Symmetry: D2
Subunit: 347 residues, 4 copies
Amino acid sequence: EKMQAIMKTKPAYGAELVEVDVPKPGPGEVLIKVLATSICGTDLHIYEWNEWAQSRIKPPQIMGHEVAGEVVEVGPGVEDLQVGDYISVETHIVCGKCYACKHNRYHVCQNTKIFGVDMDGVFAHYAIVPAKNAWKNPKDMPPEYAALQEPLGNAVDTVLAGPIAGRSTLITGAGPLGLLGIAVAKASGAYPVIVSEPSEFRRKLAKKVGADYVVNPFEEDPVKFVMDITDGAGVEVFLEFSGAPKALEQGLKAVTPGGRVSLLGLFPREVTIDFNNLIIFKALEVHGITGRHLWETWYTVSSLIQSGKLNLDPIITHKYKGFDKFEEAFELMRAGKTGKVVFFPHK
Amino acid sequence: EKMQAIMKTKPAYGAELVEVDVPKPGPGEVLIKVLATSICGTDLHIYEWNEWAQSRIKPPQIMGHEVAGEVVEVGPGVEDLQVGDYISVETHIVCGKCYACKHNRYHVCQNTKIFGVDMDGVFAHYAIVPAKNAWKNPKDMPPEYAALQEPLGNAVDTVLAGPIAGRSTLITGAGPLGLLGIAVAKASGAYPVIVSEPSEFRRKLAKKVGADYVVNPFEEDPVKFVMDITDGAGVEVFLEFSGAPKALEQGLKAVTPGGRVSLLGLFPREVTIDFNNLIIFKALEVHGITGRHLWETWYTVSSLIQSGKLNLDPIITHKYKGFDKFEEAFELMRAGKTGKVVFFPHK
Amino acid sequence: EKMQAIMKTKPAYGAELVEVDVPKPGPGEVLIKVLATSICGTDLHIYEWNEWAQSRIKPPQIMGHEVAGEVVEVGPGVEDLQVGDYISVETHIVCGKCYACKHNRYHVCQNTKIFGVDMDGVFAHYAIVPAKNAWKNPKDMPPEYAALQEPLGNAVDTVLAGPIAGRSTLITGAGPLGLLGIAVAKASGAYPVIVSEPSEFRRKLAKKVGADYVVNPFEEDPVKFVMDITDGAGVEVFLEFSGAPKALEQGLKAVTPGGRVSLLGLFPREVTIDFNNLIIFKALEVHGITGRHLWETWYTVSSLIQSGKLNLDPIITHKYKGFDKFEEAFELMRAGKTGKVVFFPHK
Amino acid sequence: EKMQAIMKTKPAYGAELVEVDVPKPGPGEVLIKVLATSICGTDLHIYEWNEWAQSRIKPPQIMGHEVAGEVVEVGPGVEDLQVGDYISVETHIVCGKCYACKHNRYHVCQNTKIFGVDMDGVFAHYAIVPAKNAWKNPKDMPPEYAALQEPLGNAVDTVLAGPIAGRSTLITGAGPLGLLGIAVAKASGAYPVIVSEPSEFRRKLAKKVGADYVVNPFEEDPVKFVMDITDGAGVEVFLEFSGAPKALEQGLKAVTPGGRVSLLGLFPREVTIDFNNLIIFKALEVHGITGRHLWETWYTVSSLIQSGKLNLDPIITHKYKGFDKFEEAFELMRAGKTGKVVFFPHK
Ligand SMILES: NC(=O)c1ccc[n+]([C@@H]2O[C@@H](COP(=O)([O-])OP(=O)(O)OC[C@@H]3O[C@@H](n4cnc5c(N)ncnc54)[C@H](O)[C@@H]3O)[C@@H](O)[C@H]2O)c1
Ligand SMILES: NC(=O)c1ccc[n+]([C@@H]2O[C@@H](COP(=O)([O-])OP(=O)(O)OC[C@@H]3O[C@@H](n4cnc5c(N)ncnc54)[C@H](O)[C@@H]3O)[C@@H](O)[C@H]2O)c1
Ligand SMILES: NC(=O)c1ccc[n+]([C@@H]2O[C@@H](COP(=O)([O-])OP(=O)(O)OC[C@@H]3O[C@@H](n4cnc5c(N)ncnc54)[C@H](O)[C@@H]3O)[C@@H](O)[C@H]2O)c1
Ligand SMILES: NC(=O)c1ccc[n+]([C@@H]2O[C@@H](COP(=O)([O-])OP(=O)(O)OC[C@@H]3O[C@@H](n4cnc5c(N)ncnc54)[C@H](O)[C@@H]3O)[C@@H](O)[C@H]2O)c1
């Protein structure tokens, strides 16, 4: 029982396509056959071998964590999963019975392990998946969609931290999460969705996903752009995808008084904010968004995917049959050339 | 100066197309040219001269309330409106002074009279409109969509009484309003939208509009149909459009525990319910839905219309030029043969 | 080691103070020295050997489940509890592996065993507690307050299904749950709290607790009473503790439009309701209330106990040392002469 | 007809007690006898003639806004008010047909004038008041309380911008708004209320009002102090009253993940915040609080007052008959030596 695996072998940059033994699932574990698997930020940082990577991941370890996989074997004393179950994985392995956790706050909740970071991930033909992190998918759901579901739940928690149907919306940043964010907003009835993005490639993508207006902040004033569209009102809803200090300010200026803000992008530094003018006098409701509601956000994700109202096709810019072009995948990724990237391990 | 009006002349079934003077705008009023005007269930009641109408309306009066109009003249001291403004009207005239209106509850709060019930409506070439009740439309909005924007506030407040993106939803009743409800729900991300409708014409329109599943409750059980779709979980949102006492019971049985019910349809008699099992051990949140949120609800409808996502044309089944066929139009309604029916008075 | 239990020995009405072998904490279980233990309506139904009781309980079974107790021994696989932890039990053994639970609805979830119904209970010097069901108390919290926290959770979920601070409140029914319901209301700033209650013993107790107005719905119309105190506005919040079909109607009439209703009290029969006038046109929000939110509801009850703002002393009308006057307790309860009744087993 | 007024005569520190004519109410206006009026921080900046006041106020003008007053005469066309009516005023003479007010966001409306900022206030024996701005008091509400109802509105909207019963609360700032903040929060069932204040006079007035723990953020770390009381959990509600840049930060570290912050204190300058650690990974909901909800917030303050639960007497520290000592009043206030200060102009 041998398989191919994308492996962090040493401390250096990069990874290796390695042949390894298929793992045996132990108690509370299932082995799945990987049908589709995608690369996020974090896999990219492990690839790059950045400063965070080095203090966290001790090679050799299998990479990846966004899957659509089929259960093939089940470990001792797993009820609830069986062979043939089609699943996706939640990697935030949570508390259970902490303060935040007893209060059902599983997204802002502490501790135990990350899957794909602290143990082997899923860029392999087969992967061990702890049964308590498994999400069952509908059987007719394309594995390539199913595999977006974790980050798509970042975008659902962001888009829908409050109501959006019929709401003028500003999105800053059209990276992978921001593109999924726009997909979620439009399926939720947001109108106009206005996207502020510096990258011309990323705005092509924004416009494709279904954004109603895109503005280039480096090129034209994104606040003035929003006041042109909203005839002076500003946007009801501002969603922060980038982490760029300037785009916080700017969206904070373009939201309407009494409007609502979702903060997902992570900042490089402390930001300097005129609180009085931008939050207290505007009476904003500002939401900090991290992690995923267990399992409310997954129900929503599953079901907007199944509605066909998510325009996901543009976001998946690259699909790769097996793991042979792994290097090229990560490289086009590093170069800002990819929407989402999907490997199909069994072509 | 003269015009035609569809007019309740005597207390009996029917209406007369009559010739009448064009009213002059007093202070705080404006005069509008009626561009499109739509037929309501209250209008059908008045025409038919049922029990409620016989109590409420004193003949003679101009019928109608649902209006897309252009301002031709403006009373003394109207600052906010001018000649040329394309407006729709909120038929509920204000309170500011009542307990319910001081609380911002205009939907529930009562009466300084109603448009087309207590005063002259807008089945007429021109109509008077208090400035306070006027909502300005974007100039590219078809008047036939603008006209529906009142009963679309009703569908908005039913659909968005709570969150709906990604939520399985049961709609009972696909009359005009229920159809409006399916189209909002689909624009707001509901999935599946399951429709329960005994009329086959009405089921075909639900399907055209965008319902994911239609069921006839006279032909099979609408609850087991729900439970087959939601794997025995039930629907998370149940919207009551019919006012059939049996629909209420079946939807309440069909809602998931923790689920959400909005009630719009008005019942014919008091309804006998199993409180304990259908509402209390299910821990349901149940809202009665009446009127419109002045004006939050109108910003949402306006912008759902401009968004392109409301599938309204399959709902608009009958368009008339002028009023000469008004009898054919009410009688087609009565007979359950219409979606929404639009008069264009100036062709 | 020998203990006293209150035991349901046969079929028959009544119970038996027997002598028994202290049990053996097994896997996932702890054993606790019982400090305070209270009787609820289900203990009364097991004792009256009603119809529900015979189909549910196979004797002999130890009775009770409202407990304040100390861990004196810990079984295999326990980890989160240890000797000396002062705890209360949550009897609804839920399961984070259902649709309702995966959605964090532990109050309307499918249940395993109930503790005190399907297995032995707490009317006894020591008791097996499953350790997943245990809630730890601050150690200076009195055992007889702590005994009350399950039913104070019903009352919290009911009082606080919505905001209540500054809010006119109608409570119908001042049995124990409505007494606790009043205590919570007054600690949460509800004002005036009006209580409708036919028993004068119970209305006396409702004033002691802190109700601002009590009315006898038998001597006087409770609706016109509310319209009096609220100058015709109606109450803003109506909480249903009785389960009297007629109180449902009357509180539905006395609540203001836009008002909020919590349904707790269980009904003898289907109730016939005018939905149009009472629910739809008043635009009510109505909450079916059952069970308790794990573990939000416990946090608030604990904290509200610790505040000393719960006027709970008037509710606890009978305290008994050990189990010897046990028959008198049940009879006083059966005859409606108690608020809550608390045993101290080690006294 | 003559009276006295505390009047901003020239652009400099201070004010003159001057004799002026008694105003005549025109249409839409009411003339009141002023029974009690408190001093606001805004009036303090008009008095000092700080920077803000230099920009906005145009002397000569009567200062003051927080009023309890008795109608003595009604202008042409006032129907809801008559002589003898006991009223309080909302000094936000609101925006009109604007976006924020059309959504019902009156608290954050960007108009129209302000009472005793842009037109004569109420530090006089008589004052003209727009009828639409008038709130009716219960005849038995003492005037010193009715007069604190506007800044009690600030405190209510801040305390109760989400749920608070049973919620561990940190209040930073026990100045006049903060003291009302603590009194509202206790009447709401908040527990514990932990107060952070440098002034010792103020920490004692905090404790008198009903704070459960006070800390000096200059003697010991308030974060650490919050961590010991809440067993390391943090506070569940963080309410910012001071506008101290250091307090904003310490609050945000103090709040539990999933916690709620309400920001009301105005900052002296832009603030530098770790967004990633303090709002985003902690998944806070942050509400900027400004103005008052017209008129829910007034219903709420009225009824909490009338309820006896607001511990208002220790807050009112200085009570003055006529305006003769109006410089002692303002000077004690600057010095930080008052809770709230009331003038009784007709002593
Ligand atoms: N909140 C959390 O705990 C959490 C969880 C997951 C991801 N994230 C964050 O969201 C992620 C977004 O992921 P991604 O895949 O979209 O990263 P990304 O680099 O691919 O996208 C974010 C950026 O937005 C654009 N941008 C940069 N400056 C801008 C500006 N000044 N105005 C407008 N747009 C600007 C950039 O071109 C880039 O697209 C990262 O920001 C990460 O910081 C946060
Ligand atoms: N609640 C409010 O304040 C408010 C305001 C306006 C209108 N309404 C109500 O909602 C409105 C809907 O109006 P419309 O224009 O959609 O009405 P409609 O009368 O034309 O049709 C609704 C019905 O649904 C179907 N139906 C009948 N029995 C059914 C059953 N047992 N199960 C499922 N479906 C069934 C019928 O074919 C019919 O179409 C009316 O009921 C109006 O009374 C309520
Ligand atoms: N919702 C759930 O799943 C759930 C959970 C726990 C308890 N409960 C229910 O609520 C419980 C209350 O328990 P208790 O211990 O307070 O019950 P209880 O029988 O001891 O008291 C309720 C009764 O309310 C009063 N009442 C009767 N008719 C009335 C009327 N017409 N108007 C006003 N009051 C009237 C009676 O005097 C009596 O006080 C019971 O009603 C039980 O039915 C429901
Ligand atoms: N948000 C709105 O739109 C709005 C409207 C009006 C007033 N306000 C604000 O709330 C008010 C606060 O209440 P006030 O009227 O009592 O003013 P206040 O100055 O008396 O209280 C603020 C300060 O709190 C204390 N403080 C200072 N530094 C602190 C620190 N580092 N940590 C903890 N506490 C500290 C000081 O003793 C002083 O009381 C003012 O800040 C005003 O700016 C806001």
